[PDB]
Every structure is written in structure tokens, then in C-alpha cells.
Design an enzyme around this catalytic site. Structure first.
Site, mmCIF file in Angstrom:
data_model
loop_
_atom_site.group_PDB
_atom_site.id
_atom_site.type_symbol
_atom_site.label_atom_id
_atom_site.label_comp_id
_atom_site.label_asym_id
_atom_site.label_seq_id
_atom_site.Cartn_x
_atom_site.Cartn_y
_atom_site.Cartn_z
ATOM 1 N N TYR A 163 0.861 -1.199 0.000
ATOM 2 C CA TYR A 163 0.000 0.000 0.000
ATOM 3 C C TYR A 163 0.890 1.239 0.000
ATOM 4 O O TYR A 163 0.759 2.136 -0.823
ATOM 5 C CB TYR A 163 -0.917 0.035 1.234
ATOM 6 C CG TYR A 163 -1.804 1.264 1.335
ATOM 7 C CD1 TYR A 163 -3.163 1.173 1.033
ATOM 8 C CD2 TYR A 163 -1.285 2.514 1.709
ATOM 9 C CE1 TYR A 163 -3.980 2.295 1.121
ATOM 10 C CE2 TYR A 163 -2.080 3.641 1.786
ATOM 11 C CZ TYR A 163 -3.437 3.516 1.494
ATOM 12 O OH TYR A 163 -4.289 4.612 1.551
ATOM 13 N N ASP A 187 -1.083 6.321 10.492
ATOM 14 C CA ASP A 187 -0.221 5.159 10.808
ATOM 15 C C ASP A 187 1.281 5.453 10.736
ATOM 16 O O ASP A 187 2.080 4.653 11.228
ATOM 17 C CB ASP A 187 -0.509 4.052 9.837
ATOM 18 C CG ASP A 187 -0.305 4.501 8.397
ATOM 19 O OD1 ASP A 187 -1.264 5.037 7.795
ATOM 20 O OD2 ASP A 187 0.815 4.329 7.882
ATOM 21 N N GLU A 206 -2.609 15.322 9.997
ATOM 22 C CA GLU A 206 -3.441 14.230 10.514
ATOM 23 C C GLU A 206 -4.352 14.810 11.565
ATOM 24 O O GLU A 206 -3.868 15.420 12.537
ATOM 25 C CB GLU A 206 -2.548 13.112 11.140
ATOM 26 C CG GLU A 206 -3.284 12.072 12.041
ATOM 27 C CD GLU A 206 -4.419 11.345 11.306
ATOM 28 O OE1 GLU A 206 -4.155 10.746 10.252
ATOM 29 O OE2 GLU A 206 -5.565 11.350 11.764
ATOM 30 N N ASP A 237 -7.112 19.373 10.943
ATOM 31 C CA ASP A 237 -7.926 19.113 9.761
ATOM 32 C C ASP A 237 -7.071 19.564 8.551
ATOM 33 O O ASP A 237 -6.586 20.710 8.536
ATOM 34 C CB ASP A 237 -9.230 19.939 9.899
ATOM 35 C CG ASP A 237 -10.223 19.712 8.770
ATOM 36 O OD1 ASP A 237 -9.927 18.967 7.830
ATOM 37 O OD2 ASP A 237 -11.284 20.360 8.797
ATOM 38 N N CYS A 238 -6.821 18.675 7.579
ATOM 39 C CA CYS A 238 -6.071 19.062 6.371
ATOM 40 C C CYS A 238 -6.691 20.190 5.512
ATOM 41 O O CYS A 238 -5.940 20.877 4.808
ATOM 42 C CB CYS A 238 -5.712 17.856 5.467
ATOM 43 S SG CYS A 238 -7.059 17.191 4.512
ATOM 44 N N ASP A 258 -3.419 10.423 1.708
ATOM 45 C CA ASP A 258 -3.725 9.155 2.427
ATOM 46 C C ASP A 258 -4.829 9.328 3.512
ATOM 47 O O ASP A 258 -4.659 8.924 4.640
ATOM 48 C CB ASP A 258 -2.429 8.584 3.026
ATOM 49 C CG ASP A 258 -2.582 7.167 3.571
ATOM 50 O OD1 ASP A 258 -3.513 6.370 3.208
ATOM 51 O OD2 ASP A 258 -1.727 6.860 4.401
ATOM 52 N N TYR A 330 -6.166 -6.563 2.508
ATOM 53 C CA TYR A 330 -7.377 -5.945 1.975
ATOM 54 C C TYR A 330 -8.434 -6.984 1.531
ATOM 55 O O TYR A 330 -9.617 -6.751 1.677
ATOM 56 C CB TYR A 330 -7.025 -5.043 0.827
ATOM 57 C CG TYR A 330 -6.625 -3.643 1.237
ATOM 58 C CD1 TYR A 330 -6.285 -3.343 2.561
ATOM 59 C CD2 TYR A 330 -6.651 -2.618 0.301
ATOM 60 C CE1 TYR A 330 -5.936 -2.058 2.928
ATOM 61 C CE2 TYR A 330 -6.263 -1.316 0.641
ATOM 62 C CZ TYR A 330 -5.942 -1.041 1.951
ATOM 63 O OH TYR A 330 -5.619 0.257 2.299
ATOM 64 N N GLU A 332 -9.129 -7.823 -1.379
ATOM 65 C CA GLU A 332 -9.714 -7.312 -2.616
ATOM 66 C C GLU A 332 -8.626 -6.471 -3.299
ATOM 67 O O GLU A 332 -7.772 -5.884 -2.626
ATOM 68 C CB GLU A 332 -11.024 -6.506 -2.408
ATOM 69 C CG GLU A 332 -10.935 -5.336 -1.428
ATOM 70 C CD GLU A 332 -12.315 -4.689 -1.113
ATOM 71 O OE1 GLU A 332 -13.202 -4.735 -1.993
ATOM 72 O OE2 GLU A 332 -12.486 -4.096 -0.005
HETATM 73 C C1 LIG Z 1 -4.767 5.800 8.585
HETATM 74 S S1 LIG Z 1 -4.621 6.703 7.080
HETATM 75 C C2 LIG Z 1 -6.173 7.592 7.145
HETATM 76 C C3 LIG Z 1 -6.112 8.832 8.050
HETATM 77 O O1 LIG Z 1 -6.760 10.015 7.525
HETATM 78 C C4 LIG Z 1 -7.178 10.777 8.647
HETATM 79 N N1 LIG Z 1 -8.162 11.827 8.271
HETATM 80 C C5 LIG Z 1 -9.414 11.713 7.915
HETATM 81 N N2 LIG Z 1 -9.960 12.908 7.636
HETATM 82 C C6 LIG Z 1 -8.993 13.840 7.767
HETATM 83 C C7 LIG Z 1 -8.905 15.307 7.619
HETATM 84 N N3 LIG Z 1 -9.998 16.069 7.218
HETATM 85 N N4 LIG Z 1 -7.668 15.846 7.836
HETATM 86 C C8 LIG Z 1 -6.597 15.097 8.250
HETATM 87 N N5 LIG Z 1 -6.615 13.739 8.419
HETATM 88 C C9 LIG Z 1 -7.802 13.100 8.213
HETATM 89 C C10 LIG Z 1 -7.701 9.785 9.657
HETATM 90 O O2 LIG Z 1 -7.661 10.339 10.979
HETATM 91 C C11 LIG Z 1 -6.743 8.613 9.440
HETATM 92 O O3 LIG Z 1 -5.684 8.682 10.401
#
Ligand SMILES: CSC[C@H]1O[C@@H](n2cnc3c(N)ncnc32)[C@H](O)[C@@H]1O
Ligand SMILES: CSC[C@H]1O[C@@H](n2cnc3c(N)ncnc32)[C@H](O)[C@@H]1O
Lengths: 345, 335
Positions: A163, A187, A206, A237-238, A258, A330, A332
Site C-alpha cells: 500500500y 499510521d 493528521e 484538519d487538512c 492518504d 485488503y 480485494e
Molecule cells: C490511517 S490513514 C487515514 C487517516 O486520515 C485521517 N483523516 C481523515 N480525515 C482527515 C482530515 N480532514 N484531515 C486530516 N486527516 C484526516 C484519519 O484520521 C486517518 O488517520
């Protein structure tokens, strides 16, 4: 809590009903019988210990047996099943799937994205907690190692180097001296694989500290420290971060999305939200850089088409490629996208 | 077939709260009460469908429905009503004309994306199924054991020694391999000779027709397929002192016999080392990574051959297998 099945594909209903009843009768079980105007028979058997069976005899050579335990009681059920198989040979395809555990303290069943029932080799719940954003489970698979499952969706196992390789561009990219943004990636896999390659800077954004901390504790195949000479993890929040970077004119060589399949929102449209993330990522991507992300399972052809629709609705023209990858845990096959800006004039 | 749907709640007042949903669909109810062990309510429908509601006395409620949209709606209603810790797994089809369920070597329940039975016949030697998977392509299943799918080039690559070997100018023996994958891949590498010994003409015929990702002819410039039991053939080659640069064991998990399971595997291994060049290598598929006892009993047989050997193993992800698999490379100790 344990449900066992036996299916016989044959084809006389009444002869089978009568021929099988002493198996249950001798176990001390009480029997009631429902008959339809040939939709066959349903026999129900109850045991004093709280287990029961159902024998369903269809009109056309289909006999289905179900036993449900309160689960010594396991050996008693296995023994009945063995007897019913013995007897059915006397009275003469057979299918005896692995029993399903129902309400187990360890949940082994994690249906695929395309809706298939799959059972995993889970021997232990390592972590199971709710953050303000999602349920976070980490479950130990004997073959796959610890598996991170977020809102019931398997995200990554310790076995899933394929992955992380695929979402970094499958060994074709040189990360040396590059500026990299990772959206999500709680992760730490992509981050840690990139740090090994001597980037200028990797930034991971993250939202959920609890995924970071659980994976630091339990997904061990650097991050004791969330900031290093060539990396930082921002716990936010991204979306506002993407906006802030665009506003400072920041551009990365690579943007690796990711996020969870359903990105987490704090606002009180599915496709529109994916497009926004795309658009915002393209705004912080150098003209000659690349964007990578996990797509979806290969069989969800409508969802892949609606996703690729959004790639046409960005502020700039883009091109893309995709590749199908086998990620061990997975169960799949999965599609991974590479996206880049079309040459300007 | 019959579709079996389930709904589990991990948490008498629940009984009376839900009874209504079934009375409205016109279903007849029968209740069984245990003194200490709760309730079982059975519901029957004139269309020949039925439900069982099992209510444990301390927190577990299990619902099962069986039928030849109505049941979906009942489950939706039961979820809403319990809201006045839930698991709703995909419904299992029982007695279906297209069988989707092929448990793993370690005994796990797994459902495949199978949409067509391409081929299902009994040969003199084994049952042969070829089933169409949307993502895996056609899947060869022998005596109910998934052997190879069109997506499984990783299998073929691993059993050829994972791209480390040079096949050019080489002599190769393949045991089994009826799907033709190894032969075809090796033919492309321009060997001196590849000899493949496959007992079952019907596997060859099935796979020619249906396993497509040559063999129009079973002999060529640099290859021959012998349609026979590989044991007599190995015995003859060992007697002749004939040797190969590579021997690839692509037999079924239980090799076919026309007349101690471990003794038979030891025999095949001992014959194979006998026909193997001192500097050659033997490759084979091992087992599921989880089957540590069977792996151990297998590796005990490696110490029981006419000559000392060394071996390594590699864990491989073969798309259609739905479990990780160990592949073995074996070679003779020097001197
Ligand atoms: C494990 S890889 C997926 C990750 O994306 C993260 N994730 C989901 N939505 C957002 C967001 N809006 N901003 C940052 N990270 C996020 C989740 O907390 C998870 O750790
Ligand atoms: C598809 S790879 C498995 C193949 O090994 C073949 N096979 C099993 N036992 C023997 C045997 N004794 N000799 C030759 N081929 C065999 C099976 O017919 C199958 O085609």
C-alpha cells in the site's frame, strides 16, 4: 454465539425429516414442525442448555441445517453435524462452511468495500477506542500483523508495505531533497518510508491524535518526536492547512492523499468534497510534481468513474494514470491513482 | 437457493418491542422460553420464508431470516426499533447455482466475487471447476481447493524463483502445472528444454479453453507435455540418471495417486533431488503461512532425503488466495 450450518443439495422431504429426527431426539431435544402447502417443512429443536437447531427442508432437494449454541456445547453441535452427514449418506453435494461466531468479544468479520463476507485470522483486540472523530480499532492478525480499522474500514496492516509503496508511486520517484505533503496517514508508514530517503521536508497533516498515538504504540512494522530535521506532523484538519499553504504560495514536489475513504469533516456532496480536496492539493502542487492517492476497490466501477469525473473539474487541466495493487490484508484488489498537471500552454 | 440474512445486537421488553414488526408482515409467531436462557421466537410466512429471533438473557439479540426486498425491509425496521454493537454481515446464499464460498486453508470463511460457472466436471482423477471472478478472472479450483486464477502471476513468479534465475539454455522439469502458466513463462525465456508432467488431460483442456491470462500444441522447439502420472516418470528419470537444472513441483496440495501423507511428499522430494543437478534448484508451493504445524512436518521431510539439502522460504501474496502463502526453494549441500 456460535452458528453452524450444513447444506445438502439433492433431488423426499418427509423421508428426510423422519430419517433425521432421532439424531435430535436422542440428544434430548424438543421438536416442533412447521409444514407449508409444499414449501416443505421447518423443524425446530430446542435444548435445555440454551442451544437450538433449525432444519429447513425445501420442496426440491435442498435441506439446510442451522445449529446455534449458547457458546462442551461446541463438541455436541459438531457431533450432531457429523451424525446428520452420516445419516444423509444412508438416506441418499454438501456444504459445511466454517461456523460464524455471533457477538464474539473478538470480531473477525470485516466485509470488503464491494460487500463480500470475509473472515480474518484475528486472535486479539489490541486497541478499540472512540476518538471525537472516529472509532479506532487495531486487531491482531496472525498473518497480517496488527490491522488498523477506522470506522469499520480496514486501512492498513503491518503486512501492507505494498500500500505504502504504491501510494508513494511504486519506486519510480526520487524523494531525495524533495518537499512532500501527506494528507492523513495517521499510521506513519508513508512518513517513515520517505524520511529514510533523505527529503528536504515531509509534512504530514493528521486530524486525529488518537490514531497517531495508537499506531505509535501498536503498528510497529522515528515518531517519538512529531518534529524532526526533515519532517513535521501537524495535528489538524487538512482542509484549513491546504488553504493556509495556498495563501502563503507554498508548493510541494509531491502531495500524497492518504485520507480515510470518507474524509473526516467538522462542518455540520460526497464527490464535491473529494473534488475540493483535489483542487486544494493541485493549488499546492508544483507544475512538475505529482499527486498520489488510493482510489477504491477494483470492482466498484461506478464509484471509480464518478471519482475520475472530478479530476476534470479542477482549477487546472490534469492528466492521470492508475494501477491495480494487491494489498495483503485488503482481501480485494485496489486501484491507486497518480495525478499531475498538464503542461501549461 | 436460499438467502440467509443476519443481524446481531450486542447490548421480556425486547421481545414485545419487536414482535410487532413480524405481525404486520402477516407472519405467524411461535415463542419458546427457557427458564434461564432467554427466548427463541420463530416466525413463518406463507411464501415459505422464516425468521428466528434469539434473545439471550444478558445483552445478545440474534436475528436470522431465510427466503427463496421484504426481508431487507424487516431488518431495516428491526434496526430502527432497537434504537427505540450492531453487526449486519452480507447475507449468505445457500444452495446457490453459483457457489461463491471457498474457505481458506486455515479454515476461514471467505466469499469471492464469482458471477459465472465457466466449467465444472469430474475427471477420472478429481473434480475440476473454473469460476469467473470479476477481479481475479477465471479461477481454477481442484477438489474444492483454489489453485490459480488469471490474476495470479505472483504465484508463477514465486514458483520460478522470483526473477533471480536464468532459464536461458536450461533443462527444466515441471510436475503438474496443468494450467500451463509456468511452461509458458519459461518457454518465453528460451530454455534448452522444458518437460511438464501432468496427469490430467481434462485440466489441460479446461485451462487451454478458459485460462487465458501456445499450448495449441503439447510439443514444441523447446518443450513437451507428458500426459501421465509424474511418479512413474520421475522413477524412470532417476533410474536413467537423467538430470535437470530446475525441477518445479506445481502439483496439487495432496498429489494425485492411482493406488504417510508425509511419506508420499518425501518420496516426491527424494525423486526430484535425484533428478536435480548438483548446482540446480528445486522450487515448490508450501502452504498457508498460518499452518505452522504442517509447515514444520513438511520441513522435517527435507532432512529425510538420499542427500543433504538446504532450503529457504519466501512469503508471497497471490491475489486470489486470500491468505499469505509460503514458497520453498531447495538445493543440495556441497561436497
Ligand atoms: C490511517 S490513514 C487515514 C487517516 O486520515 C485521517 N483523516 C481523515 N480525515 C482527515 C482530515 N480532514 N484531515 C486530516 N486527516 C484526516 C484519519 O484520521 C486517518 O488517520
Ligand atoms: C493446476 S497445478 C496442479 C496440477 O497438478 C496435477 N497433479 C496432481 N497430482 C499429479 C501427479 N501425480 N502427476 C502429475 N500431475 C499431478 C493436477 O492434475 C493439477 O493439474
Amino acid at each position: 454465539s456460535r452458528h453452524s450450518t450444513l447444506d445438502f443439495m439433492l433431488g423426499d422431504g418427509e423421508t428426510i425429516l423422519k430419517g433425521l429426527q432421532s439424531i435430535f431426539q436422542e440428544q434430548g431435544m424438543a421438536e416442533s414442525v412447521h409444514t407449508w402447502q409444499d414449501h416443505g417443512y421447518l423443524a425446530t429443536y430446542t435444548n435445555k442448555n440454551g442451544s437450538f437447531a433449525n432444519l429447513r427442508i425445501y420442496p426440491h432437494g435442498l435441506v439446510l441445517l442451522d445449529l446455534q449454541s449458547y457458546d462442551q456445547g461446541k463438541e455436541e453441535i459438531d457431533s450432531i453435524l457429523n451424525k446428520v452427514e452420516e445419516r444423509m449418506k444412508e438416506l441418499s453435494r454438501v456444504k459445511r462452511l466454517p461456523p460464524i461466531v455471533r457477538g464474539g468479544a473478538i470480531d473477525r468479520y470485516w466485509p470488503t468495500a464491494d460487500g463480500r463476507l470475509v473472515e480474518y485470522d484475528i486472535d486479539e483486540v489490541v486497541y478499540d477506542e472512540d476518538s471525537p472523530y472516529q472509532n479506532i480499532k487495531i486487531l491482531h492478525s496472525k498473518q497480517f500483523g496488527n490491522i488498523l480499522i477506522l470506522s469499520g474500514d480496514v486501512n492498513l496492516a503491518e503486512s501492507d508495505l505494498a500500500y505504502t509503496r504504491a501510494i508513494m508511486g511504486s519506486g519510480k520517484e526520487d524523494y531525495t531533497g524533495k518537499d512532500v505533503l501527506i494528507l492523513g496517514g495517521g499510521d506513519g508508514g508513508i512518513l517513515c518510508e520517505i524520511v529514510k530517503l533523505k527529503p528536504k521536508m515531509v509534512t504530514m497533516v493528521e486530524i486525529d491524535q488518537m490514531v497517531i498515538d495508537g499506531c505509535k504504540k501498536y503498528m510497529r512494522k522515528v515518531l517519538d518526536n512529531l518534529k524532526g530535521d526533515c519532517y513535521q506532523v501537524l495535528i489538524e484538519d487538512c482542509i484549513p492547512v491546504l488553504k493556509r499553504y495556498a495563501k502563503e504560495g507554498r508548493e510541494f514536489d509531491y502531495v500524497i492523499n492518504d485520507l480515510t475513504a470518507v474524509p473526516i469533516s467538522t462542518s455540520p456532496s460526497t464527490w464535491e468534497f473529494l473534488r475540493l480536496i483535489l483542487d486544494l492539493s493541485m493549488k499546492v502542487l508544483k507544475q512538475d510534481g505529482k499527486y498520489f492517492t488510493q482510489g477504491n476497490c477494483v470492482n466498484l466501477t461506478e464509484a471509480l468513474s464518478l471519482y475520475e469525473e472530478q479530476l476534470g473539474r479542477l482549477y487546472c487541466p490534469v492528466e492521470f494514470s492508475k494501477e491495480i495493487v494487491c494489498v495483503p490484508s485488503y482481501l480485494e484488489l485496489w486501484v491507486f491513482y497518480t495525478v499531475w498537471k498538464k503542461a501549461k500552454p
